[model samples]
Target: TIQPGTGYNNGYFYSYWNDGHGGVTYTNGPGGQFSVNWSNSGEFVGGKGWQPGTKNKVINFSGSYNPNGNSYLSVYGWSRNPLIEYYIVENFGTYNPSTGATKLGEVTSDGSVYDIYRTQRVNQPSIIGTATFYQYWSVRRNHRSSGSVNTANHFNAWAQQGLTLGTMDYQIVAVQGYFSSGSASITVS
Candidate 1:
């Protein structure tokens, strides 16, 4: 869920879309890389709430699910109401059982915002539940213009539920934050 303003601003040298995959891709650092591309009028927020403009889009991080043993990643948009940023990407692979394959991990997030939610529960499930969302556009300027009008109404509900995703190993237990009342559960094994 990386919808904010679609990174890379020019108001005075802003920067968002660096195509590095946010962080912790085995510490390749500086926009790691798995998939990144966003434009669509630039603006979005998730869990349904705010929006504006919205155009050019392409965000995928090779989600075949297997964030390494135990995983839970949460990210809600609308940095004003629908704000939730939770993360957990523990160790999963890099090799050492007897040789080396590579599947390392370590990512944490919970900067702040009300209705926030994050969870992790992995005993085994290396990669097969699909997971990847990255969008950016918040350097400041009033949360990058209302977080780009709440990510253009959360990319119009992710373009009417057509984000091209299939092949399940799904294990996100439950999460429903944003004006949060209650909703969070995880127990994978």
Candidate 2:
């Protein structure tokens, strides 16, 4: 069982089960490569790049994803100043996170269109402790398993909608499963 916490190793910041249960394992390959296997009620697994995350650079990733039940494949991370949890959902199982969210607008990135949405989280846990914050989303209209996320494209698109972000935190390529079991072997750069 991999302990639930965050740490830097193999040139990546690895984390597991920030919230949820089940048995999970995070194995580091070489460089920015890692694989996760989990069986639980729900779990979150992924890691951040070097440190400050990229500002304008393209974040490239390739992976073999196998997910069961409810799951999400996304570029998940947080920002400071305004305390925002953001996601660029590339693939999902049964639940569409944007089911009840306010559709702000849409944008095209990586040759795919994404519907933008904004939702508020009241008194929820965040990087800066329990507080109120907003969640920004870019749910891909067409889902896929592997692709590159152009950070600037989405960031600029969000800013156009008055969805500004603060200093970058640990931007990670993350996977979440709820009452599910899944495995992903991903490499990020």
Candidate 3:
């Protein structure tokens, strides 16, 4: 999760839930890649056999951020219900114009926001699998004021990160994205 009002240039935030099975895994090497089980209700019979269920699967997101300078990334997740809201902030260390490698920091969620994380992780982690929704805001510095404000006309874009179940489910939801005033676009994979 990212810290709101902490963004400087451009940055992005993303969220992902791990499926109970070995469906979600990540390997970092020459290049990083992630694999996720698209079916949330697939039964594991005997051991490894799979049986499909009617419930929705889980939605996962991965994104990158490159702020031209120091910045923070604010992330939030919520269910369809207003009561199900969560938020977090990731304070990437001060930006280095030379290296451009911002130090990644720990992920912390607001107490109120974490309740949602816990609920989903414990009970319905996969209830909205392929059907995740996201909202993002970008703040770009203003040369005149030497401060930042939400970019105009930059809100409400559908989630670009998701999984597709075999052939039965076609659930679509939201994912998040953003860009700083002087940085490259963030890509969510």
Q: Which candidate has the highest lDDT of all?
A: 2
Query: lDDT at 30 for candidate 2?
Result: 79
> Each prediction's TM-score against the native?
0.20, 0.91, 0.20
Better of 1 and 2 by lDDT: 2
**Candidate 3 C-alpha lDDT tens digits along 105-162:** 2221221111111222233333354433322222222111111111111111111211
Candidate 2, residues 54-90: lDDT per residue as tens digits? 5575877788878777788888888889789988999
Could you give me the TM-score of model 1 versus the true structure? 0.20
**Model 2 residue 170 distance off true place after TM-score fit, in angstroms:** 0.8
Best by TM-score: 2
Q: Mark the 10 consecutive residues where model 3 has the least summed lDDT.
A: 44-53
Evaluate all candidate structures by whole-model CA lDDT and list the values in order: 0.21, 0.79, 0.23
lDDT of 1 by residue, 24-96 (tens): 2110112312211222212111121112211322211212223222222222221112221211121112221
Candidate number that wins on TM-score, 2 or 3: 2
Rank by lDDT, highest first. 2, 3, 1
Following a full C-alpha superposition, what root-mean-square deviation does model 1 have from the true structure?
19.6
Off by over 4 Å in 1: 1-26, 29-31, 34-56, 63-65, 73-78, 81-154, 158-189
